[PDB]
Amino acid sequence: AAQTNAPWGLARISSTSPGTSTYYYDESAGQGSCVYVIDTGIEASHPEFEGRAQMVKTYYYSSRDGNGHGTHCAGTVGSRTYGVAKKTQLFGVKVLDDNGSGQYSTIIAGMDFVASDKNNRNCPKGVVASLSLGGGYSSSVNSAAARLQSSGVMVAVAAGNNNADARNYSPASEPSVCTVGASDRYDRRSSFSNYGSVLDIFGPGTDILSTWIGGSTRSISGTSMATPHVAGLAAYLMTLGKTTAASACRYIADTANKGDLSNIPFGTVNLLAYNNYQA
């Protein structure tokens, strides 16, 4: 399948070269997979989700996304026009308030929830968790992400946005999950993207158009915009039988475009996520 006048980042992950504008993907597009966006909530009523999203857990007085951040991230995973895995199921887990902040014990409660809740859903091709959130290093939060991945959910996390070695942030630094830095549309590391050997992969994270609240759209930036591109790609590749939750980070990094990016510090991977699609 081909989606013309795609957002650049979609086009970028189905190409070996920058600068095109079409998104090439297999029509399965994540059917039978499930992605949990752990964030500020999702606006499931948004036309772009077409009945495929719902909110399953909050830790605040409301399940609603009053911020926008989680609706944007969910749109990059799953929306009809803006998403990578257009047919996946999209679950919302509100661990962040409507200004975007949480306490680490609630973020920890949220990961534990998905490890349990996946068994109450119908995800025959598998389960991904996307966490466009980070703080300073906390062993407790690293261990929760490790448990979530161990349970059989493919965990993808934002490297962080401080232009620093991600070893000092969590859960970016946990080795067993899939740590995601961000690139721009000319194949440079984004200016804010954390780096270092704990990174696994880069994805598009500068000027990312996606769904916003109030039934709208907006183009925003961050490693949190790069992370759901990778999460959606994992959902896609599990529907195709190409990998499993345990080893989708390894398959993505192995099948990536290698050596395209500029502005990569020695010691960091130079790998940009690719979907391996040949029509």
Q: Which residues form the interface with Ca ion (CB under 5 A)?
A: 200, 249
- Helices 223-239 and 248-255: crossing angle, nearest 10°? 100
The annotation status of 153 as a binding-site residue, yes or no, is no
Residue type, 96: L
Give dist(CA 134, CA 76) in Å, integer: 19
> Exposed (0-12), middle (13-18) or buried (19+): which is 118, by Cβ within 10 Å?
buried
Query: Catalytic residue at 262?
Result: no
> Exposed (0-12), middle (13-18) or buried (19+): which is 106, by Cβ within 10 Å?
middle
Nearer to Ca ion, 63 or 255 (CB): 255
Nearer to Ca ion, 141 or 249 (CB): 249
| CB 68 to Ca ion: min, Å | 29
Of 14, 15, 33, 39, which residue is the catalytic one? 39
| CB 176 to Ca ion: min, Å | 6
Residue 273, sorted as left (phi over 0), alpha (psi -120 to 50) or beta, turns out to be: beta
Nearer to Ca ion, 39 or 200 (CB): 200
Give dist(CA 107, CA 121) in Å, integer: 21
Dihedral, CA atoms, 110, 268, 206, 180, nearest 10 degrees? -20
* Residue pair 166/199 in contact by the 8 Å Cβ criterion: yes
Nearer to Ca ion, 55 or 158 (CB): 158
The annotation status of 207 as a binding-site residue, yes or no, is no
Query: Catalytic residue at 46?
Result: no
Nearer to Ca ion, 165 or 200 (CB): 200
Give the nearest residue (CB) to Ca ion.
249
Of 69, 79, 193, 221, which residue is the catalytic one? 69
* Residue pair 11/21 in contact by the 8 Å Cβ criterion: yes
| CB 126 to Ca ion: min, Å | 17
The annotation status of 177 as a binding-site residue, yes or no, is yes
Task: Name the residue with tokens 């499931």.
Answer: 44
Query: Catalytic residue at 229?
Result: no
| CB 149 to Ca ion: min, Å | 9
Angle made by CA atoms 65, 71, 76, in degrees to the nearest 5: 170
The annotation status of 175 as a binding-site residue, yes or no, is yes
Tokens of 50: 């077409």
Of 46, 183, 224, 229, which residue is the catalytic one? 224
| CB 19 to Ca ion: min, Å | 30
Q: Which residues are catalytic?
A: 39, 69, 224
Q: Which residues are annotated as a binding site for Ca(2+)?
A: 16, 175, 177, 200, 260
